[PDB]
Design an enzyme around this catalytic site. Structure first.
Site, PDB file in Angstrom:
ATOM      1  N   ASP C 142       0.829  -1.210   0.000  1.00 25.90           N
ATOM      2  CA  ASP C 142       0.000   0.000   0.000  1.00 25.90           C
ATOM      3  C   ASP C 142       0.865   1.262   0.000  1.00 25.90           C
ATOM      4  OD1 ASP C 142      -2.333  -1.515  -0.219  1.00 25.90           O
ATOM      5  OD2 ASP C 142      -2.995  -1.219   1.852  1.00 25.90           O
ATOM      6  N   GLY C 167      15.479  -3.701   5.373  1.00 23.93           N
ATOM      7  CA  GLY C 167      16.438  -4.460   4.569  1.00 23.93           C
ATOM      8  C   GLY C 167      17.505  -5.127   5.423  1.00 23.93           C
ATOM      9  N   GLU C 190       6.181  -1.494  11.400  1.00 26.67           N
ATOM     10  CA  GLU C 190       7.538  -1.688  10.933  1.00 26.67           C
ATOM     11  C   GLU C 190       8.017  -3.078  11.350  1.00 26.67           C
ATOM     12  OE1 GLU C 190       9.164   0.944   9.248  1.00 26.67           O
ATOM     13  OE2 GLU C 190      11.001  -0.222   9.001  1.00 26.67           O
TER      14      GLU C 190
END
Lengths: 261, 258, 257
Positions: C142, C167, C190
């Protein structure tokens, strides 16, 4: 004295700013404002800096920024077909050559952008992110994906602004210090630093820490509550303070450890 | 308008027979006009009728049909990349005169989808405005904010950086997220799932409001859901588990102003 | 392929001698092929082998060598601005037929780097997918979400608005962030630093999960790190300090399947 003569013109233009518009402004004023923007863009001038040991704002440079808005009309900005933009502040990179990019020593990862009148130092990596006018981003700093460096913000060397981090702008009030993140700070993902809060060097701010002028900063060791400043070497996490009545608690930041360089 | 709703509502019933390769001229024109009307703000997905926010389900139907009637196509961007979608930018065909008449600013790389309304004196910092949204006069949409599908944003609203306003294109009957006039929504907050924030409210940073978020009124001790009453000051908080072992996220109304 | 890994592993040991102007044709070809295979999803940085997620360090090496072998260059954008980087867009050379065959949507201004896999029936709202990532079938990414380097996103995952998946290109041995099939991740959450979210999990808004985040299981009272068990429903909470003066952020598992 060059900067002194420059400030004199800007300060008077500001006082007389109601005379100024995109169709009406003396060549001297237009040239002064453009030069101030160029100097901010190159980092030869900066909106705030240390003077006699203390962070100090140059109000006239904020005035130059605000005048630069007054002196330009919005215009369509082309983008190869899929859409268009419409604004009065050019991209910092609008007129860059390959040589300009090579000399700058930073990376601009698409679709990252910075406005003209912000400084991006050598060894900075801009992931897709936004750097607003008047900002200063010093060497080695990482600006991660969907982060924002707001207007006039001063970002030190080797700072890590993680994903979705917001550094607030403070173009107005003119007297107010911008948000300042000192050297070697880590700001974890989705955190926010706004409203002139200063994070001093070597601090580590975790995820989801939201620091504005009304955010209670609770020092776990001392039990003291403060506002507006993260002392050098602080490790900061999100927490809550309990209401006296025991029914709820309210968001705060907690300093959980203090470390040296 | 009633003639337009008539055509859309009947096309919805028979949508199984509609594609990019098969659709009557009348149905294509009706849907296209509904999108044009939403884009200009002449129609809106929800509005306040007789003092109560009301959804026009047929305009949601128009939006959904507009997806069904178009194929994805490559979208050019001057070389660095391409996109691939079936919904055009609101600004795809804008002339300088169009932007001048619109009276708003689109700060690069901000974008809005065709079929959303942006009022005069709005500033779009880089941000996203999805189809069916309505953003009224004087509103500031800050950097990496999102105005989701069908959202109704009032006049002189400040959506701070990283604020997400959720979409509610479906269910058809469901009210979209509504932010009434003069509200401040602080950085990195979220309002989703048809929550309404009533006028003159001040939402601080990191406030996440969905249909299941407990809204704790500090003064009264009452927990409510789905609505921030007019003039509320709202901050992030927690409510304690009865057993004292932990606490869970909530929003807390700390003050009421006007 | 094995011959590919041998070439890449050796190039890695010799990486000090490699540059955009110095590198054998064999090494350039091997690295380029590895990137192409990642981009197509024929290879992937981590995968589940015998029930166990396993990283292929040589594919991370390939990604890192791909940076070493290329200079930054200006990237054009139709006039309003320019970029300056050494990693091309995944879509730089796509034809209409390439997009047709891929079966995904790229909503402007979404972008993915070359060397990431986007499966069919994926919708990329404006968002960022970094190199080495794998986004599997049916997934929704999104607006202003991020799929970070080497992240493994399963099938039918919903990454809501402003969700950041971190990452993990380095360290080489470290597992990337892994979001297993059918997970919902709520807005502005997150997941970073190699946390794994197991299948069928539901994460609410404002949940921030890194390696230091306490995961409190409400049912058992147990605190754990780095893993959301399959079928967990997770919300933001706090744990009280012993002295009663404050509490500290955590994630709370409030329900299981």
């Amino acid at each position: 004295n060059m900067s002194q003569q420059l400030q004199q013109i800007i300060d008077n233009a500001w006082e007389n700013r109601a005379e100024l518009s995109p169709k009406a402004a003396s060549a001297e004023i237009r040239e002064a404002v453009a030069h101030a923007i160029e100097q901010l863009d190159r980092g030869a001038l900066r909106v705030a800096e240390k003077i006699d040991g203390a962070w100090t704002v140059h109000q006239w440079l904020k005035k130059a920024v605000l005048l630069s808005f007054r002196l330009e009309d919005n215009a369509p900005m082309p983008a190869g077909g899929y859409s268009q933009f419409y604004d009065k502040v050019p991209s910092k990179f609008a007129n860059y050559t390959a040589e300009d990019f090579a000399a700058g020593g930073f990376r601009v990862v698409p679709p990252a952008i910075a406005r003209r009148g912000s400084f991006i130092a050598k060894n900075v990596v801009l992931m897709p992110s936004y750097t607003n006018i008047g900002a200063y981003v010093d060497e080695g700093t990482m600006v991660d994906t969907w982060a924002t460096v707001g207007s006039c913000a001063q970002i030190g060397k080797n700072v890590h602004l993680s994903g979705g981090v917001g550094i607030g702008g403070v173009l107005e009030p003119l007297q107010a210090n911008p948000v300042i993140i000192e050297d070697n700070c880590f700001i974890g993902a989705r955190s926010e630093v706004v409203e002139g809060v200063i994070v001093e060097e070597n601090s580590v701010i975790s995820m989801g820490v939201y620091l504005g002028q009304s955010t209670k900063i609770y020092d776990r060791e001392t039990g003291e509550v403060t506002y507006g400043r993260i002392p050098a070497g602080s490790v900061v996490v999100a927490g809550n303070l309990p209401a006296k009545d025991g029914t709820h608690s309210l968001y705060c930041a907690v300093i959980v450890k203090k470390v040296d360089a």
